[PDB]
């Protein structure tokens, strides 16, 4: 079958995309690095069927606190997120702290 080859070729491409994304976001402020973790697949038989992406987690360690000088900036040192609302009414949680009026 082509299946064992193509599932591996599909799952090794998200593993490069999530590294390219981490590389490209090397200067965004409230950004957390990511990684991909896999899991194999079995039917009722004894031979494997391929591989499956189990979910892309995130790394929630704390970055360095960089001084800026502007007045309306906040940084957090431990757990906790700022709580912002959209124009619709949907609440959102964030870690970046560049504010304005």
């Amino acid at each position: 079958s082509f299946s064992q080859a193509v599932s591996g070729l599909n799952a090794a491409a998200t593993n490069l995309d999530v590294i390219g994304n981490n590389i490209a976001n090397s200067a965004t402020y409230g950004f957390k690095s990511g990684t991909a973790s896999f899991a194999d697949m079995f039917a009722g038989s004894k031979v494997g069927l391929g591989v499956k992406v189990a979910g892309i987690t995130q790394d929630f360690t704390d970055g360095t606190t960089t001084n800026t000088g502007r007045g309306l900036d906040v940084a957090i040192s431990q757990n906790g997120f700022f709580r912002l609302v959209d124009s619709n009414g949907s609440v959102f949680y964030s870690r970046n702290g560049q504010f304005k009026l």
């Binding site: 599909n10 491409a13 619709n88």
Partner: protein
Amino acid sequence: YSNEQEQVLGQIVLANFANNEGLASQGDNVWAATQASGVALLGTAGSGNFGKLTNGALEASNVDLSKELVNMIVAQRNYQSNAQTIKTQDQILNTLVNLR
């Protein structure tokens, strides 16, 4: 304008459908609405269930290249194996039409 003033020449309206994949692709990079999609349901940019715009930017075409270059290899083998049935259906007909 040249007199410390601004005029409003209209607002861009977006549309949102109850069901995609019923939109018929007509000619250019353009869809048309019909049955199995619903009515238009126009709306504003910001508020509601509609996303916001962005000035000075476009949107690309989401077509992967490596994912499409490994489906041609499967489609070519499917074609070449379907062609090996016409071979047998012609050979049995040739050997039937020439016995008497």
